[PDB]
Symmetry: D5
Subunit: 141 residues, 10 copies
């Protein structure tokens, strides 16, 4: 039924540590590679913003799995639509931490695509979330 892209956000569980983030990256890369899924996970200011690209069914099944994870709560879908080609091609999953990135670059990128004084993905539109993640992916290459 074709290639799709999903974008959703969520609130991280309190006290998340680096080993927790690395654990997410490690399982996501293996499962996604198996499932034909690509994407990117953005972490900052206690919030997750993720995009997954792939088959309509596979991406749905992965999202239903991600909802069971106790490392986050209060998930919101931002968008689900058919896409002509992938944007997030290179990584089965890439984690980007806004805190390990140039303070100035991120502030300008977060301002560019958002009205918020901090990283607040609930205040961004679907196209803003996409373009935010696209620039993170393009610089994190």
């Amino acid at each position: 039924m074709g290639l799709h892209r999903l974008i959703f956000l969520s609130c991280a569980t309190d006290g998340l540590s680096y080993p927790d983030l690395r654990d997410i990256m490690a399982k996501s890369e293996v499962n996604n590679l198996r499932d034909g899924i690509t994407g990117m996970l953005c972490y900052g200011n206690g919030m997750f913003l993720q995009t997954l690209e792939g088959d309509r069914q596979k991406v749905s099944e992965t999202y239903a799995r991600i909802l069971k994870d106790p490392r986050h709560h209060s998930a919101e879908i931002v968008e689900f639509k058919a896409i002509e080609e992938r944007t997030f091609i290179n990584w089965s999953m890439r984690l980007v931490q806004l805190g390990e990135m140039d303070s100035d670059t991120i502030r300008r990128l977060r301002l560019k695509y958002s009205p918020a004084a901090t990283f607040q993905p609930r205040s961004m539109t679907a196209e803003q979330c996409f373009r935010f993640l696209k620039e993170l992916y393009d610089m994190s290459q």
Copy 2:
């Protein structure tokens, strides 16, 4: 906030699904969706569920997260999630439409109009086809 959205998803009915089960689903959704500002429509046929929800980005997502935990269906597949200027499915907090209790010639034309399948197969339908199929049902009701 963030605005009005519509979700469209499909799923498989669990084997043994009973009319009571159908009525229990409708009873709880109507109370919940009314509380949440959610309207929409549930189509059941050929062992398949095809549903749409309209409302707040967060609320619809939370309702979908709850629906994913229901054992009365399995293998849910998201069809689309996007922002909308206005609602189509205004009249009912949640309306159940059974394809089997309907004019066989009306439903045959409808299912053919918006799908390539010889029976009702939402998995073979695009997001636009599911929207238009459901809308004709809503209008016919």
Copy 3:
């Protein structure tokens, strides 16, 4: 003289607003707006105000700055201000529509049509949703 414009804004009615308040707002609004070439419509429901004003860029702005000084409401939020080819809200210099003095079902369906909320919440509505909500009310009030 920069053409015809439309402003849309919303606000919270102040606690204790009474029918005399609504009449005073309408009485001054009709006189000022007729003087200023301003037309529009004010919607009241669920403790919220939703209003649109059409006219000259300077006049409408001046009318809005006066409105922000009015103690009969608070927490104003601008929804949209843009140039327009033609007016939609032609007939009245100002018209009050109370959502509660109307067919509950017609309004319930309209409030659902153009918003995600279980109640009248103009802060949850877009500029296009506010305009189309207001236009349908205007078309029914004729």
Copy 4:
């Protein structure tokens, strides 16, 4: 949360406006705008102000309502207020540009480029001209 918006307004500076008065304005705007997630640009020339603010619909409104109470100007005119997909005035929570301290030729050409007036007259300019005028100022900083 109804998304990112841009406000543009103009006003007349009250007589006697002083250099310390402008610096005070710039000092409070940077603090307030940074607090509120707001960015923008203030233009001063020919006794007139032309400013733009980007950010949240509610915050920008509340900021305009505060600016309207300031005795250092009068006769404000809204030029446009609308939703935007991305910010243009990303770099400064607030920046002052004095047209009088700029190349008489660079500013004269820019003033003619975007208005029919022989002097700076933002009231004679469309929303698009004010935007494009302020943007070139922004790009020259």
Copy 5:
């Protein structure tokens, strides 16, 4: 021959304009415009003229140069001049519409519809607003 065009302009009527003045204008516009393949409509109201002319690029220009020389009005403003695929104002070489001989409420709402002004002020209206205002006048008073 560069095709069909439309001109829209406005002006202030000179003080003391009389009904015979409007009649001399109308009798002469009809004869000249019929000769020159020009059609159009003149609106008079609130001491202001708002007129449109359709025809050949050169003919319309010359008629405007003639109109500019007339002492019966002053302070003309061009609102628009462009090529058009087809005429809107076809039925009359020139038709005069006086806003005062028409339904106040009909004209009132029409003037608000296409302008920000509390009275008829073509100087506050765009080319498109002027076009649409004149077109509704032309359509309603087909007589």
Copy 6:
């Protein structure tokens, strides 16, 4: 009511002299700077092709004065419309004479934007006159 552009053409009156041109350019520069008007005047093959940018009322009044000038006759308006920004920014008024340019570059420019073997602005559309003038202005 915003920034507008006018383009018109005309026939020069027989006996046009440089002094004649000197008076035109001198009063135009003064008058246009006062009025917020910019533009360009093209002369060639006995024809004027002009563009003026500025306020709707000002540009019109200037056109009315230009129509009284006896140094030319048979004006035609080419277009009058609103514009987002000026193209002809640099000069309150600039004269360009086609005859004092490469017999090759202008031949082309003209042929590019007209069906005629000589400069015949009555044969050009509004968009052809604009682009033709924009190319001339862009050269200086």
Copy 7:
């Protein structure tokens, strides 16, 4: 072949054209155009011809090449030649409409609607005006 096309051209009647000439033109046109799959419409008025032919790119061209050798007119000028998705002038292999036998006011308004002229002057008309002019004449028959 290479598709359905429409040609529109105009010409001046050779001075002294007679009714029998027009008859003979119409009789050859119906026979030839019917043989060649060509349809169209010929307007005559004020000493001018305005005609359109629809059909094969080759057939219409050759027929036009034959019309060019006819001494009953001169000064032919092509108005338009392009590919078309469907015919407008379907009903007749060739139909003659004389502007001289029509409601004097109907023809006056039609000529004014699609021309800057006080007389029928097809040389003063664009390709779209000729098309719309002939189409209205066709619809009144």
Copy 8:
């Protein structure tokens, strides 16, 4: 992969019989109903013009089978694309014979959508074939 529509044309083999047409119609109706396929068959002037809607795979497989039928030759694909909704809903396969309908209606229809003096789908674009088949279908 979704709903598609195919259009193809061919020459009927010499000797085509009404019984021949009926075997085609009967086997097509059964197979297409099995295959979720709908469509329309046009026959005139010795030519076939057909459209099928359904699954990309299914429609292709049916076309491959049509290519082996000896009752026609010189098949030519006209169009194959994804479609949002079916136009040819009502019948799995419906035969419309051009030659036995109103002579004037089919003359106008065939002229409307083609440069030819007889039915010649080889002279028609994809859109012409589609709009032609659709007007036939709408008349049934």
Copy 9:
């Protein structure tokens, strides 16, 4: 009525000689220069493909004279429409012989804009002919 472009094709008459080609080019340069006409004539595979830009009347009359020339036959109009600017500016008439150019540049060009295994303008659309001719002109 402004600037137009014509595109047409024809078959060269049997026996066409280089002097014949040189005379066509010679009279075309004079007539077109007088008539304000520019364009390009492409000769290949025994076929002519030409385009002319200029005034609507002049271009037509020139086409009518071209139709009486016995050095070619079977003319087909490809397209005739209004244009905003000339593409074939530099030359009142220029010959491009496909045979005197790189077989590979021309082979690739001919495939890009046609379904044919050789140069066959009768198989090309108006847009394909224009773009074909424009690439020749730009590389010329």
Copy 10:
């Protein structure tokens, strides 16, 4: 009737050999050159994906011949439409084998234009097949 493009896919019959491919390329190179046909053949993961550009009739007949070939089975048409210009100009027929290429560029190219974890033209849209083929043609010059 102009230039067209066909795209189709099929399953290679079991046991396909290098000689098998050489014979396919050999006749296709000859036949397409005779027919004015250009195109490209992609082989990978036991699947064929091909495009042919040329005349509507010739391309159709070449497809009819290809369907009789027993070296593949289960052919599926992807798209057939008229085109303004060719994309695959340089070759009458060129074979590209995905396994004789860099796992990365092919893997990422294949992910770019499909949801699948391996090459599966059956899950690809018409526009994805075209773009997949076009990047292959562009790389192998």
